Symmetry: C2
Subunit: 303 residues, 2 copies
């Protein structure tokens, strides 16, 4: 490929954290494409660790398997909007199962080229379950099952049942309920497991952007339970932003860049419902612009 | 009063963190009544700092104003179930406004006898706003307005508009959306503001307990938008439990006791809707039992 630039090793732990957000990760991919092109290497050759939640876990997993961002974009375009276009629990659940199997096949957490964390929510304990790999990885679960769990947005998708290698059966739902912004769990991994000093950590947290809130009049035309749909989206946004604020309070001294800017267009449905590829494709340009507003600091962070 | 026991000062920072939970804080009060009676002094004479969110902020504020738990219980019984009994946005909003004015009148954050933090959620930035006092306190806002904001569970209550002393107008909603379990924000206050070492901190986090999840059949009889009601409750529970897990990951070395046990009765509606004083009064005994299962460690933590 064209990404032939090589970087020497140092004692700096470079961490990438990708928010969930329905099919709006086209924004995320626009940011990531510019970071990749800036660096001249696949992202796994520069970052030590990537965390992702829900559809951000799709991107994180492909990064950790060594994909280039244009390849991720092709896979994302051909599978993620179809999931969000579903309008029944059966259709949503089967569409997501098909995505997971088709995109990740039988890759496991022993197949990754960098550190990875994928966040889901445990139904019974209401606490996170984080699938990890490096170099029992992922609790013995396939990447497809872990990403599927990370994306299982009950009550609109079915809960995802997995059995760990130790034989424990757990029901899981979308990780956005506990960590749609996974950055604090990534920082915990860098500080508590990888035993890195705060000064030696660099965190890039890429969101999906912020767009005009859909109003009840619009949601009522595309969803019979529009209030639940609106509540899901607003609580997801609050958890995403408040997690960022909690990070800034507790870890002032961990160098961090968060890229998730606010735009007045496109007008979209919620993350659960939006699948219009015309609107979603415009988010790539918005992500590129968000990179451009931070390129000098991103250069000094990476490189 | 009967609470005449006196404690000497030491270099230990004793922190109390109270979860929100509708009218289910009868459980919280049962735990607190036993801690008070164990200590033999009003809680403000032993704890340095109390944080609360939503109806837990009602209890936190009364503690910080110097109330004894039996007095708090009387105020809670006469005002909080009436709020939750409301079945319209207008009725809920007026009931909460009446609670705030009647219970706190014109007390300000300069009137507290200990450290206090009360958490609300900013509507536009989707990030916490924490009203603080010790000894511009509370951003110049009254305790009544801060507690009201902490409890304003939009979309079912109106958002609460406040103007800070610096002249900034902010719209606020219930703090449970960002920190229904406020413990991490309390730890940030003890470590980042009060500059306490982790070894010198003692955290008691009292919840409202965990009870059987209400099913759609029951919610459909008491709420026209039952799915939104169920989603609100489940997301609130996940934020409460996952915040506790995040604390345990990031602050292994801060001594902490969380008291929020699981029970099979009473069968109740969600936090938003439950107002049956018969059921709710039984939660006091459950809180007393939860204290009893931890009394030896609580003695060594306090005292």
């Amino acid at each position: 490929s064209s990404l032939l630039t090589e970087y020497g090793n140092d004692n700096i732990c470079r961490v990438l954290a990708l928010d969930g957000g329905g099919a709006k990760g086209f924004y995320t991919l626009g940011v990531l494409k510019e970071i990749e092109a800036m660096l001249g290497c696949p992202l796994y050759k520069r970052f030590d660790l990537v965390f992702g939640t829900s559809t951000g876990a799709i991107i994180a997993a492909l990064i950790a398997l060594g994909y280039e961002v244009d390849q991720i974009h092709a896979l994302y375009t051909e599978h993620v909007p179809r999931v969000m276009s579903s309008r029944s629990a059966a259709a949503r659940t089967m569409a997501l199962q098909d995505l997971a199997k088709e995109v990740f096949q039988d890759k496991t957490f022993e197949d990754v080229l960098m550190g990875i964390g994928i966040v889901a929510t445990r139904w019974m304990t209401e606490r996170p379950m984080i699938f990890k790999g490096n170099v029992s990885p992922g609790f013995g679960v396939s990447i497809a099952d872990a990403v599927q769990a990370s994306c299982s947005a009950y009550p609109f998708f079915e809960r995802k049942v997995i059995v760990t290698a130790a034989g424990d059966k757990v029901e899981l739902i979308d990780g956005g309920y506990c960590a749609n912004n996974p950055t604090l769990f990534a920082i915990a991994d860098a500080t508590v497991a990888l035993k890195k000093d705060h000064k030696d950590i660099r965190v890039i947290n890429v969101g999906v952007g912020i767009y005009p809130e859909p109003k009840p009049g619009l949601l009522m035309r595309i969803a019979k339970k529009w209030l639940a749909v609106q509540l899901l989206q607003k609580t997801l946004e609050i958890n995403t932003q408040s997690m960022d604020q909690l990070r800034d309070i507790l870890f002032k001294d961990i160098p961090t860049i968060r890229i998730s800017d606010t735009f007045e267009r496109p007008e979209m449905a919620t993350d659960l419902l939006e699948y219009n590829l015309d609107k979603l494709n415009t988010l790539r340009q918005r992500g590129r612009e968000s990179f451009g507003a931070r390129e000098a600091q991103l250069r000094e962070f990476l490189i």
